[PDB]
Design a protein around this nucleic acid. Structure first.
Ligand code: NA
Ligand code: NA
Length: 321
DNA sequence: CCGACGTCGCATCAGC
DNA sequence: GCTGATGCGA
DNA sequence: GTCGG
């Protein structure tokens, strides 16, 4: 419908983030693309688009040029710019952000082939990113996520039967494919007021599900994993997996949040204000008359939170908005 | 006109 | 060596 | 770049 326009805007968004280092303009272009992607008519003028929340003057001007000519002069130029297109491209490697990519490109390093010739100039994280460059840009079909979940719930339970683990993200909401796996972990010995994460990571490296580590501390693990290769069949791609340990009395707040979607969370947080509650990723708190937040309220399920705000429990499946 | 635009854990850097 | 800033991804 | 106090 408006694929032309939203690829244009998404492409422009990337140059802002990666080359210009203008994070807010990146987010403006993305938000403009989203609204346009949802617009159920083929757009005829920038004026038509400007009416949508997140489309201003400059993007209207650009939509008009694209409609009249089928291209954007600035984008054509940017796209053919040797420096910018390389900087933009290197940020596709996980761990190479806009600043490292600018440095690489300053000293001549432009391509994966170049990154490969200069491993010693990469931190740990960036090497992993480079190694799994193709695998990381693949999506993960739901089927494989169920298999991955099977493994993670098994090996958690097998470390200590009292752990609670939940695979969140769009997967929890029923999505047909995911970008990564987001695992939220908790245990009744850990509240707000030991080795609980290391032990679980250890078990998953021990049965060869976890294959690499990006980062790991007391509360959050970022790394890589892979389903076991079925007899003589082709090996599965390597996948991104995060695991976070969350205090028991903040866990359901964490699950609700990390399940999303972003839009859904936005609605609920708003609805929660007008009902006198502040909900962050951690806690739900009451708001006194002058706007001052009281003690985090006890939460023992996702549902407890909905109750607090006089809303009816909605399944992850329908938390689309 | 002009500031907000999310916030934070971890790894690694810059400064002392 | 320690502490805070910054880059990064989410 | 867009919005809104
Ligand atoms: Na507008
Ligand atoms: Na990157």
């Amino acid at each position: 419908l408006n694929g032309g326009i939203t690829d244009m805007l998404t492409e422009l968004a990337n140059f802002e983030k990666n080359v210009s280092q203008a994070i807010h303009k990146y987010n403006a272009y993305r938000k403009a693309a989203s609204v346009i992607a949802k617009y159920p008519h083929k757009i005829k003028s920038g004026a038509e688009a400007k009416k949508l929340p997140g489309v201003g003057t400059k993007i209207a001007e650009k939509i008009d040029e694209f409609l009249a000519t089928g291209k954007l002069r600035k984008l054509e130029k940017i796209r053919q710019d040797d420096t910018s297109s390389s900087i933009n491209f290197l940020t596709r490697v996980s761990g190479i952000g806009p600043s490292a990519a600018r440095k690489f490109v300053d000293e001549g390093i432009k391509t994966l082939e170049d990154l490969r010739k200069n491993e010693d100039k990469l931190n740990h994280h960036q090497r992993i990113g480079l190694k799994y460059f193709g695998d990381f840009e693949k999506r993960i079909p739901r089927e494989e996520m169920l298999q991955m979940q099977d493994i993670v719930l098994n090996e958690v339970k097998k470390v200590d039967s009292e752990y609670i683990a939940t695979v969140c993200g769009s997967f929890r909401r029923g999505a047909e494919s995911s970008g990564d796996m987001d695992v939220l972990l908790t245990h009744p010995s850990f509240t707000s007021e030991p080795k609980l994460l290391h032990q679980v990571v250890e078990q998953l490296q021990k049965v060869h599900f976890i294959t690499d580590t990006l980062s790991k501390g007391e509360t959050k693990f970022m790394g890589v994993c892979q389903l076991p290769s079925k007899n003589d069949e082709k090996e599965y791609p390597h996948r991104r997996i995060d695991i976070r340990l969350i205090p028991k009395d903040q866990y359901y707040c964490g699950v609700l949040y990390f399940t999303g979607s972003d839009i859904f969370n936005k609605n609920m947080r708003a609805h929660a204000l007008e009902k006198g509650f502040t909900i962050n990723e951690y806690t739900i708190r009451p708001l006194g008359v002058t706007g001052v937040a009281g003690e985090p309220l006890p939460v023992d399920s996702e549902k407890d939170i909905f109750d607090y705000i006089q809303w009816k429990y909605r399944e992850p499946k329908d938390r689309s908005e």
